[PDB]
Design a protein around this ligand. Structure first.
Ligand SMILES: [Zn+2]
Lengths: 67, 52, 168, 370, 51
C-alpha cells in the first residue's frame, strides 16, 4: 500500500508544484485585471461588511476604500 | 557555542564615557590563571578537568 | 411536632441557600407581592370556605399572631450573613415602613419551615400547636400551588461595592 | 517631526509610598536620556494641559472623581468608608498630589488624541499615561483614571474603528470592561493567565452584544521569550488588521513583560519588546504610544528611550551618553536589556492552539451569516 | 501610486500574459515589474511577497 501511494504522489509532483506554488500570482492577475470569480466577490463582501454599508450604491470593484 | 563566545565578548565592551568618569571596573582581573589552548572549547575543557 | 414541606419548596430553599451564600446573589427587597398581601390573600381564601364562628375566630387570631411575629422576627433569625448589609441599607432607605410591608414570601417560608424548632422551646397547649401547624401546612400548599405569582423568578447579583462593603 | 512627545516636568516628583513598585521617576529618567541623546530636536515637545473633572467624568462616575478630588492623606482617616468602597487605600495608596498626577496623565493622553485628530502628528507618545486597570467606579492595580479610555473616546469623534494593543504582562481589564459591548473599539491584550493579578482574561471572554468577537485575549504561561512572543504576536495582529481594519492604534508599551521585573514573569529583551512596536508602526496608521507598567526603572528607562528613538526614526547609539542618572545603569553602561534563562513553559502546541482559536473568532465576524 | 495610465495598463497586460502562459517562467515578469515599478521601492519590495 505504501509503495502504490508513494508512486502516485511522486508522479503528481511537477504539477503539485505548478498549481500550488504559483497560486499566489494568479490571484494577483484576477485582482489587477478585475475578472469576477467567486473568491473575488467574497472578498468584496468582506470589505462591505467591514465598512458597514446600509443603502447607498456600491462604489466600484477597485474603489471600496479600506485601503 | 564558539560564535556566541565572540558575540558575548562584543556585548561586554567598555564605554568611553564611563572610562572618563572613572567608574569602569574590568572583569578580566577576576579570572584566575586561564589556560592558553587553541580553541575556547579546549580552554573550557581544561577548566572542567581542573574542577574534577 | 413535624411538618410536611413539599419537595418543590425543599428544592427552592436549597437553591436559594446556595444562590445567596456561595454564588453572591440577592433578592430585590421591595417586593411586588407583599408579605401582608399574601397573608391577606390566604386568610380571605380560607375564611371564604371556613365553617363555624369558633374556627373563624381561631384562624383570625392565628393570622394575627403570624403577621406580628414576622414583623418582630425577620431581622433576628431569618437572614444569612450576606444579607445584613442589604437589611441595614433597606432600613436606612425606608425607616418608616415596616418589614411586613417590605419583605416577601421567600422569607415567610423560612419563618414557616423554622417554626418547629421554635415550638420546640415553646410549650403551649397541644391543641393550639396542632391548629397552628395545620394552618402552616395549608399555607405552604397554597404557596406551592400559586408559585407563578408569589415567588421571584431571577436573583440579582450584588455589585462590587456591596461585596467590598459586606466582606464577610 | 511627526512624533508629538508629551512630558510635564513635574511628573517625576510624585511618590506612591515607602517601598511601592510604581514610581513616576521613570518618566524623568526617560526624558533625561532623551534630552542627552539629542532627540529633543527631532521630537515635538508639548507640555500637556491638565484634565478637568468634566474631562474625567466622561468615563468615570461623578462621586468617584469627586472623592479623588477631595481626598488627602490626612483626612483619609475620616474618609475611611468611601475608601474601602472605592478600592483606594491598600495597593493604590492615597498620596500627595494624587489628583494632580491623574490630571497630568489624562491630559497627556487626551492631548495625544487631539493631535492625531488635528493631523499635526501621526505618532503621539505619552509615557506618563497608560493606566489600564482603572474601572468605571473603583481604582485598581496602581491605577486611578483610564486615560486610555478617555483617549479612545477622543479618537472616535473622527475615526470609525480603533484598535487597542496591550503588551503589559497583566490583562487590560479596565479598557476591556469599558469597551466590552461595542464594535468600534477592538481590544487585543497579551497577558499571563492563571494565578495572577487581574484574574480576568480567559480565551473565551470575547464580548457580548454588538461587541461579540471584539475582545481578543491571548493568555500565556510563565517564561515566554522573544521568538515565542513573536510567533504569537505577529499572526494575531496581522489577522486583526486584516479582518477588523482600524484607522487608529493605541499601543500600551508596558514593560513589565521584560526580563528581571519585580512583578512580571516573562523573559522578553529590548529587541523582543521592540519588534512589537516595529510591527505596529509598519502599517502607517495613526498611533498613540502610551506607557504603562514597568517596575524596574533601569530597564524601563532604557527600553522606552530606545522605543522613542525607533518611532522617531533615529537609531540611537549603543553607549549611554552622560546623564544625571548614569550610576543607575549597571557595570556595562549600555542601551540594552538582556534576557535570562528561566526555562520556558509555552509549548508550540499551546501557542498554535490559542492562535487558531483567535483566528477562528476573528474570521467568524465575516463568515457566519447574520 | 501610478497615476499615469500606460504603466498600470502594462502591469495588467503582463500579469495577464503570465496567467495565460504566453511568457516565460517568472523571468520576464519579474524584470518588467521591477522596471515599471522602480521609482517606488516600497511597492517593488512588497511585490516579492507574491513570488
Ligand atoms: Zn502591568
Amino acid at each position: 500500500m505504501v509503495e502504490q501511494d508513494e508512486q502516485l504522489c511522486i508522479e503528481t509532483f511537477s504539477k503539485f508544484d505548478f498549481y500550488a506554488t504559483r497560486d499566489c500570482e494568479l490571484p494577483l492577475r484576477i485582482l489587477c485585471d478585475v475578472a469576477n470569480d467567486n473568491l473575488e466577490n467574497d472578498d468584496y463582501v468582506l470589505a462591505l461588511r467591514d465598512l458597514l454599508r446600509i443603502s447607498k450604491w456600491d462604489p466600484n470593484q477597485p474603489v471600496p476604500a479600506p485601503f | 557555542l564558539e560564535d556566541q563566545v565572540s558575540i558575548i565578548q562584543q556585548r561586554i565592551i567598555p564605554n568611553p564615557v564611563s572610562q572618563k568618569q572613572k567608574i569602569w571596573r574590568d572583569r578580566w582581573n577576576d579570572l584566575s590563571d586561564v589556560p592558553d589552548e587553541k580553541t575556547h572549547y579546549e580552554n573550557t575543557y581544561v577548566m572542567i578537568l581542573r574542577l574534577i | 411536632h413535624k411538618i410536611s414541606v413539599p419537595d418543590v419548596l425543599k428544592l427552592w430553599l436549597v437553591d436559594d441557600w446556595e444562590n445567596i451564600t456561595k454564588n453572591q446573589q440577592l433578592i430585590a427587597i421591595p417586593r411586588n407581592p407583599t408579605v401582608r398581601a399574601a397573608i391577606a390573600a390566604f386568610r380571605e381564601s380560607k375564611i371564604s370556605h371556613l365553617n363555624n364562628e369558633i374556627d373563624v375566630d381561631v384562624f383570625e387570631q392565628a393570622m394575627a399572631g403570624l403577621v406580628i411575629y414576622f414583623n418582630k422576627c425577620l431581622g433576628n433569625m431569618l437572614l444569612y450573613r450576606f444579607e445584613r448589609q442589604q437589611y441595614l441599607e433597606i432600613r436606612q432607605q425606608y425607616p418608616d415602613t415596616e418589614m411586613c410591608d417590605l419583605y416577601g414570601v421567600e422569607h415567610l417560608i423560612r419563618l414557616f419551615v423554622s417554626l418547629p424548632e421554635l415550638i420546640d422551646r415553646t410549650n403551649m397547649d397541644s391543641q393550639s400547636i396542632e391548629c397552628l401547624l395545620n394552618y402552616i401546612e395549608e399555607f405552604l400548599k397554597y404557596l406551592v400551588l400559586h408559585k407563578d405569582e408569589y415567588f421571584i423568578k431571577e436573583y440579582q447579583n450584588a455589585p462590587p461595592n456591596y461585596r467590598s462593603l459586606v466582606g464577610v | 517631526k511627526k512624533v508629538s512627545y508629551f512630558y510635564d516636568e513635574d511628573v517625576g516628583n510624585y511618590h506612591y509610598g515607602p517601598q511601592h513598585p510604581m514610581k513616576p521617576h521613570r518618566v524623568r529618567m526617560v526624558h533625561n536620556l532623551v534630552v542627552n541623546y539629542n532627540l529633543y530636536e527631532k521630537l515635538n515637545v508639548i507640555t500637556p494641559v491638565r484634565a478637568t473633572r468634566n474631562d474625567m467624568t466622561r468615563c468615570h462616575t461623578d462621586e468617584y472623581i469627586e472623592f479623588l478630588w477631595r481626598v488627602t492623606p490626612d483626612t483619609m482617616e475620616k474618609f475611611q468608608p468611601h475608601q474601602l468602597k472605592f478600592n483606594v487605600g491598600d495597593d493604590c495608596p492615597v498620596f500627595d498630589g494624587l489628583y494632580e498626577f491623574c490630571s497630568i496623565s489624562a491630559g497627556g493622553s487626551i492631548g495625544a488624541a487631539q493631535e492625531l485628530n488635528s493631523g499635526n502628528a501621526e505618532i503621539a507618545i505619552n509615557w506618563a499615561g497608560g493606566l489600564h486597570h482603572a474601572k468605571k467606579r473603583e481604582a485598581s492595580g496602581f491605577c486611578y483614571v483610564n486615560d486610555i479610555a478617555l483617549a479612545a473616546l477622543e479618537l472616535l469623534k473622527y475615526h470609525q474603528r480603533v484598535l487597542y494593543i496591550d503588551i503589559d504582562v497583566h490583562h487590560g481589564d479596565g479598557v476591556e470592561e469599558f469597551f466590552y459591548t461595542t464594535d468600534r473599539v477592538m481590544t487585543c491584550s497579551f497577558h499571563k493567565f492563571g494565578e495572577y493579578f487581574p484574574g480576568t482574561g480567559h480565551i473565551k471572554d470575547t464580548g457580548i452584544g454588538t461587541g461579540k468577537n471584539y475582545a481578543v485575549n491571548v493568555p500565556l504561561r510563565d517564561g515566554i521569550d522573544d521568538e515565542s512572543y513573536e510567533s504569537v504576536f505577529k499572526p494575531v495582529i496581522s489577522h486583526i488588521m486584516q479582518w477588523f481594519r482600524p484607522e487608529a492604534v493605541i499601543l500600551q508599551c508596558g514593560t513589565d513583560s521584560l526580563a528581571g521585573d519585580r512583578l512580571g514573569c516573562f523573559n522578553l529583551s529590548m529587541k523582543g519588546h521592540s519588534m512589537c512596536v516595529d510591527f505596529v508602526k509598519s502599517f502607517n496608521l495613526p498611533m498613540i504610544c502610551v506607557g504603562g507598567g514597568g517596575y524596574t526603572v533601569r530597564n524601563v528607562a532604557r527600553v522606552w528611550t530606545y522605543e522613542t528613538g525607533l518611532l522617531a526614526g533615529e537609531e540611537l547609539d549603543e553607549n549611554l551618553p552622560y546623564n544625571d542618572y548614569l550610576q543607575y545603569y549597571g557595570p556595562d553602561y549600555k542601551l540594552n536589556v538582556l534576557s535570562n534563562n528561566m526555562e520556558n513553559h509555552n509549548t508550540r502546541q499551546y501557542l498554535d492552539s490559542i492562535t487558531s482559536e483567535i483566528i477562528e473568532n476573528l474570521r467568524n465576524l465575516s463568515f457566519a451569516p447574520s | 501610486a501610478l497615476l499615469s495610465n500606460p504603466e498600470q495598463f502594462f502591469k495588467l497586460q503582463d500579469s495577464l500574459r503570465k496567467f495565460k502562459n504566453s511568457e516565460c517562467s517568472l523571468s520576464e515578469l519579474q524584470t518588467i515589474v521591477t522596471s515599471l515599478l522602480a521609482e517606488h521601492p516600497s511597492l517593488a519590495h512588497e511585490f516579492h511577497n507574491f513570488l
